[PDB]
Design a protein around this ligand. Structure first.
Ligand SMILES: Nc1ncnc2c1ncn2[C@@H]1O[C@H](COP(=O)(O)O)[C@@H](O)[C@H]1O
Ligand SMILES: O=C(O)c1ccccc1O
Length: 494
């Protein structure tokens, strides 16, 4: 508390000096990299940096990134060794962007985890002796020619000691064994998350996932699997179809032995007329749902409130493959009122105005204007200098001297159900090969493109349209099952 109260007041009061000091911390060891040498940055000088280092897009610097991805020394862009890459949900030329990465990403990520934990406990009581049923997933890595792995942000965390050796307190205590969280087969691991959460239902004081789409999926899978889950509880055995050795061993220990009475109890709850409030009925000690409900995830809020009996939905964190940005300092607000306060120790932040309210070319964090929209620009600890993020944010206020931002949209994105972010360009290519709407009225959600009939021909249209989308889409569609068959309404399905 005392340490935290002071910590937060300082971070948010001293933004100007923290940002300027951070930029010096980044630039000084990097003055001899090929990249900074190119732009004649031979010492820390903020004015020369702003004047001479260009504001770049991913495509602008891809030739440097490709070199590091292929095995060239990371000193071309960063004197802090690059030890891996992050796979962005954002795409470049149909291929997922690969951002450079090192353990500073995890230093900052864990800093934010500890900070948001304190923010939550300040405002929410009755959580410190319980566990969380957190639907957390690991995604198998992709190998690059350099031999370094490329992972999604949270997988870079789970597959590290930052997670394995995390703090032993309520916030880091889950109903699922680590083996379940680490399991790269997410169909198996989601089933196991639910089973373990049910067995330990009285201990659950929070539940959630990174994004709302995954929370909704977990509930939908519960609705479709409860009979089987209860049979495992009754018998004290995990279903044979789960092949992961880690899950088998760890979940067997959670089960312990036959629990016919607990099975009866759960079955009676699931057999009611309606699924309304099911989360709070199965997990009666839950204090809040922890999941992002901003941006494209806002579409899931009505379903969440239905299943959770208006438990608070707490949307804590805004982050990307470039850097974690910051957190929600008013966690108990309504989803539509969520703003994120950037933390000035994360990266050096600049902002390009996206409307007429601010006529500058680019501005520092401390200079953004209320009610104006911007694209964030990031200088980080892994070789990105003044990189455009492609998101649009709106200044809603200032907490002490720290600007607070509403997430508006990812620029150019037209369709999003889960982690997929299909942009106008991808959709143009698809309809060529052949308007739209993201339908989440049913699960899973699915794309809907408005365009007797040759049903073979129009079913092939749906097909070639999907085949032209990106790898994130195809993973959600064919592997996760988080996205259903694309639908063309002239109705035909892929
Ligand atoms: N709290 C949030 N609310 C809305 N969108 C978010 C949030 N956090 C991340 N995102 C979006 O998800 C994108 C994915 O980042 P990346 O890890 O590069 O795929 C971000 O750039 C944002 O567009
Ligand atoms: O790690 C998280 O909890 C997180 C949440 C939202 C966006 C990016 C993130 O890494």
């Amino acid at each position: 508390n005392e340490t935290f109260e002071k910590q937060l007041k300082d971070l948010t009061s001293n933004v100007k000096s923290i940002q300027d000091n951070l930029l010096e911390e980044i630039i000084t060891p990097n003055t001899k990299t090929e990249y900074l040498q190119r732009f004649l940055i031979d010492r820390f000088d903020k004015e020369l940096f702003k004047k001479n280092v260009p504001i770049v897009s991913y495509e602008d610097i891809k030739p440097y990134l490709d070199r590091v991805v292929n095995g060239e020394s990371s000193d071309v862009i960063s004197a802090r060794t690059i030890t891996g890459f992050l796979l962005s949900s954002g795409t470049s030329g149909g291929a997922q962007k690969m951002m450079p990465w090192n353990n500073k990403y995890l230093d900052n990520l864990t800093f934010i985890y500890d900070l948001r934990m304190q923010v939550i406990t300040k405002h929410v009581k009755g959580v410190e002796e319980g566990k969380g049923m957190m639907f957390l997933f690991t995604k198998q890595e992709s190998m690059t020619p350099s031999g370094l792995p490329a992972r999604v942000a949270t997988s870079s965390y789970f597959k590290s000691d930052y997670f394995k050796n995390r703090p032993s307190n309520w916030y880091y205590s889950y109903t699922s064994p680590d083996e379940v969280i680490l399991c790269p087969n997410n169909t198996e691991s989601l089933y196991c998350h639910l089973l373990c959460g049910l067995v330990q239902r009285d201990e659950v004081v929070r539940t959630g996932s990174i994004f709302a789409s995954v929370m909704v999926r977990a509930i939908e899978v519960l609705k479709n699997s409860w009979e089987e889950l209860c049979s495992n509880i009754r018998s004290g055995h995990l279903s044979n179809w789960v092949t992961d050795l880690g899950c088998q061993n760890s979940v067997s220990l959670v089960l312990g032995g036959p629990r016919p009475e607990l099975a009866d109890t759960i079955e009676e709850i699931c057999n009611q007329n309606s699924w309304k409030g099911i989360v709070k009925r199965l997990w009666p000690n839950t204090k809040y749902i922890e999941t992002v409900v901003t941006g494209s995830m806002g579409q899931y809020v009505p379903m969440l409130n239905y299943y959770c009996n208006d438990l608070p939905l707490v949307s804590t964190t805004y982050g990307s493959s470039e850097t974690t940005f910051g957190i929600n300092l008013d966690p108990l607000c309504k989803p539509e009122d969520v703003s994120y306060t950037f933390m000035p120790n994360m990266s050096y932040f600049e902002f390009i105005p996206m409307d007429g309210g601010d006529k500058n070319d680019v501005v520092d964090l401390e200079d953004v204007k209320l009610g104006c929209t911007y694209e964030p620009v990031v200088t980080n600890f892994a070789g990105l200098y003044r990189m455009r993020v492609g998101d649009i944010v709106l200044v809603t206020g200032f907490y002490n001297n720290a600007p607070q931002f509403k997430f508006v949209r990812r620029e150019n994105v037209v369709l999003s159900i889960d982690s997929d972010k299909t942009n106008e360009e991808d959709l143009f290519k698809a309809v060529s090969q052949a308007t739209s709407y993201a339908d989440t009225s049913t699960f899973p959600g699915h794309y809907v493109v408005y365009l007797e009939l040759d049903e073979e021909a129009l079913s092939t249209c749906c097909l070639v349209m999907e085949e032209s989308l990106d790898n994130v889409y195809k993973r959600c569609r064919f592997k996760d099952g988080s996205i259903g068959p694309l639908e063309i309404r002239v109705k035909f399905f892929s």
